[PDB]
């Protein structure tokens, strides 16, 4: 799941319970012998200065040595990230 | 319970044999009996076996 919310001021409840339902359908939050934690990944990108970081963090996923929560200054960085990702696979020829 | 240390007529070979047997007994027998335990346990909530 990739989410590009600029706001997320809640209106109609919190989306934590539905994440719990989603991971219960896939048998993720029920056993520790087979956690199966890697079959669902939620990435949330923060845009603008009106972001609530704790709500985004509680909405996204958390696995060690990995970052699932991001934040950018402007919308320009949003496509800067993906243009850089495109250019990563390009040959070293271009400047 | 006997406490015999040789002495007599030809009481030499037996004393040597009993003393060498006692020496082997002391050399081989440890201060205790064999004890090597491998105790494991398993939990219904933990996948690993804690040994």
């Amino acid at each position: 799941i990739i989410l590009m919310t600029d706001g997320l001021h809640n209106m109609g409840g919190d989306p934590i319970t539905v994440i719990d339902e989603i991971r219960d359908l896939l048998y993720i939050g029920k056993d520790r012998k087979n956690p199966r934690e890697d079959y669902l990944d939620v990435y949330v990108f923060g845009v603008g200065p009106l972001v609530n970081q704790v709500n985004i963090n509680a909405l996204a996923s958390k696995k060690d040595n990995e970052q699932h929560v991001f934040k950018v200054k402007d919308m320009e960085n949003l496509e800067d990230v993906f243009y850089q990702m495109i250019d990563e696979s390009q040959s070293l020829s271009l400047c | 319970e006997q406490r015999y240390y040789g002495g007599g007529y030809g009481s030499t070979q037996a004393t040597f044999m009993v003393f060498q047997a006692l020496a082997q007994y002391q050399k081989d027998a440890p201060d205790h009996q064999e004890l090597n335990l491998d105790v494991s346990l398993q939990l219904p909530s933990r996948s690993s076996k804690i040994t």
């Binding site: 012998k33 087979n34 890697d38 040595n65 | 996948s47 690993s48 076996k49 804690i50 040994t51």
Partner: protein
């Protein structure tokens, strides 16, 4: 039950060098009694070294949870440096996304009688090899056959290479049913160099007919570089003592050889193939 990976043969009458449980998701491990790790997504390395007058005899690693994958498809455990028969080896094991824990016990035997002839032979070697598998023969020419249930690799024509329980095995060349096993020879670590040779009797009832080689060797990679073992000259009836040389890309740690004799043999064995 767990996934048990074995290097060498377990002995019930020996002692263990050490025993520790390792969390494979830990970064890095806990240095238990003074041994270092290297843990990655795809590798787990233990740079174990002992301070006792003994030689490593076996290694057993138990991985949890049990995952239904055959262990004979590829290789998982190997001592990158040293190995069985030495006092220390850099033990490398490759992990999986499901395995999260490990339990490593290592066994050592006194350096005085540091031999493995008493465990790799068994009761009757006539029908059962070191691997514990029975011998199978064919009626086309009354000779042996081939096994295809373990990990094997080839480099040139008519080259046999087997790998099981850390054992690397080869046969030169083939064995007949009527042949009678005579004896075996062992090579210690102190007698191992980059290149070395052997001398065997080849007279009267000791006419060489078939030989097999089992060994423990190091690896610099997951894919090993097999030693170039080739026979020199002809083991004919004239030369009373037959010899065989070994050329090694990687230093060996242990070597075991079994001798098969048949006076009626002609000294050459090869199928009608080209």
């Amino acid at each position: 039950d767990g996934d048990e990976y074995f290097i060498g043969k377990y002995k019930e009458k020996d002692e263990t060098l050490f025993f520790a449980s390792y969390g494979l998701k830990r970064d890095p491990c806990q240095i238990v009694l003074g041994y270092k790790c290297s843990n990655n997504q795809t590798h787990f390395v233990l740079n174990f070294k002992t301070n006792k007058k003994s030689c490593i005899s076996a290694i057993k690693l138990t991985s949890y949870p049990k995952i239904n994958q055959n262990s004979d498809l590829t290789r998982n455990l190997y001592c990158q440096t040293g190995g069985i028969g030495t006092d220390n080896c850099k033990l490398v094991f490759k992990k999986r996304k499901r395995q999260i824990a490990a339990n490593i016990e290592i066994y050592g035997i006194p350096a005085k009688k540091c031999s493995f002839k008493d465990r790799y032979i068994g009761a009757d070697p006539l029908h059962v090899d070191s691997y514990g598998l029975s011998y199978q023969f064919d009626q086309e020419h009354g000779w042996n056959l081939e096994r295809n249930n373990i990990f094997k690799d080839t480099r040139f024509s008519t080259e046999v290479f087997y790998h099981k329980n850390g054992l690397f095995n080869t046969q030169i060349t083939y064995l007949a049913e009527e042949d009678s096993f005579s004896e075996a020879r062992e090579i210690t670590a102190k007698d191992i160099k980059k290149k070395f040779s052997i001398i065997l009797p080849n007279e009267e009832y000791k006419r060489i007919s078939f030989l097999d080689v089992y060994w423990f060797q190091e690896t610099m990679r997951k894919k090993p570089k097999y030693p170039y073992i080739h026979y020199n000259g002809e083991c004919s009836n004239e030369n009373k003592t037959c010899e065989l040389v070994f050329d090694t890309d990687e230093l060996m740690t242990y070597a075991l050889v079994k001798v098969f004799t048949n006076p009626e043999s002609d000294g050459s064995r090869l199928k009608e193939e080209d």
